[PDB]
Amino acid sequence: KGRLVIYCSATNVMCENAAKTFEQKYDVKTSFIRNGSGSTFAKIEAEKNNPQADVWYGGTLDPQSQAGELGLLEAYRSPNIDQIMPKFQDPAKVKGNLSSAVYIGILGFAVNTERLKKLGIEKIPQCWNDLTDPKLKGEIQIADPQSSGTAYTAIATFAQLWGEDKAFDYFKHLHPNISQYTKSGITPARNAARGETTVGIGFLHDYALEKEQGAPLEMVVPCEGTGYELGGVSILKGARNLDNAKLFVDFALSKEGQETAWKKGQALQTLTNTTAEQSPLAFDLTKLKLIDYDFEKYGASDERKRLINKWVDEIKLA
């Protein structure tokens, strides 16, 4: 018994299902507030002297790793860690399971095929470099590196894929086609689905759900190769309900806690627990051209600040 307060950074449906399922299982009064991973980091940091939640569930790992480095988290290694894909068992900058990995999300883009026809573009873009086509001017959205974890994952991915120089050259040539840098990582999926933009860049599972729900979207794992987020779970330093936060980490890393995300929580990420059944709509990492994402390097405060700063100077303001 007792209570649990969650800062959730997954989609609302996923958060609500996790909270409800956890409360039903353990008889713990559980609540959550949802913000993206970027805006959750900012709030946890701001509240450091009097923390307002017990656990941070979901959202890109980099800001969780950064919070770990900054002393905002409380280490706890669940026994369920042994079931997690080994390379994702303790992937953050500061080791000791201040953060753990609960899912994988593939970076890519999706194309609204109905709107594409209106643009007079015959071929569905298949490569990152296809997004620099002037015919796509004002027809692409991605989240804002200044605010969004998804957008940071994108920058870090490009830097690792092509080297930093080429990554920023790409951003420079993508930039003229971006109609809006969104505050939320998921807004480009919403907008692409509804035909308000033609191409959304973000994590493919979000576009996959919109597609299965009827949106005219073609998902693209870009031809050059791509990267991914890990979704994180982390207990906050100063958690008022520490035992329940640990139980929740166990749940988050468990076979049934992960399976429920797609079975009931309408969230189609790939699961990190090797004993869990995957959604038939989840991406299979073994089939994809993926970098080896260095969370130790990119999940650090200096590097995150540096790259975001460089983006503002070189892409937004240059």
Ligand X SMILES: O=P(O)(O)OC[C@@H](O)[C@H]1O[C@](O)(CO)[C@@H](O)[C@@H]1O
Q: Binding site for beta-D-fructose 6-phosphate: residue ranges? A: 34, 37, 59, 149-150, 185, 205-206, 229, 269
CB of 243 to ligand X, least distance (A): 26
CB of 205 to ligand X, least distance (A): 6
Rounded to a whole number of angstroms, the CA Rg of the chain reads 19
Query: What is the per-residue DSSP string for 47-71?
Result: TTTS---SEEEEEEHHHHHHHHHTT
Report how far residue 90's alpha carbon sits from residue 84's, in angstroms, rounded to the nearest whole number: 9
Token pair for 120: 């007079």
The residues that touch ligand X, with contacts defined as CB under 6 A, are: 9-11, 36-39, 58-60, 105, 143, 148-150, 184-186, 203, 205-206, 229, 231, 267, 269
28/257 with CB nearer ligand X? 257
28/101 with CB nearer ligand X? 101
Q: Which helix (H) or strand (E) holds 265?
A: none
38/68 with CB nearer ligand X? 38
Query: What is the per-residue DSSP string for 79-134?
Result: GGGGGB-GGGSS-SSSTTTSSEEEEEEEEEEEEEHHHHHHTT--SPP-SGGGGG-G
247/267 with CB nearer ligand X? 267
The answer to whether the beta carbons of residues 74 and 176 sit under 8 Å apart is: no
CB of 59 to ligand X, least distance (A): 4
CB of 203 to ligand X, least distance (A): 4
CB of 133 to ligand X, least distance (A): 25
Binding residues for alpha-D-glucose 6-phosphate, by number, are 34, 37, 103, 148-150, 185, 206, 229, 269
Helix axes 149-162, 37-46, angle to 10 degrees: 110
Parallel, antiparallel or unpaired: strands 217-220 and 73-74: unpaired
Q: What sign does the CA torsion over 241, 78, 231, 275 have?
A: negative
28/104 with CB nearer ligand X? 104
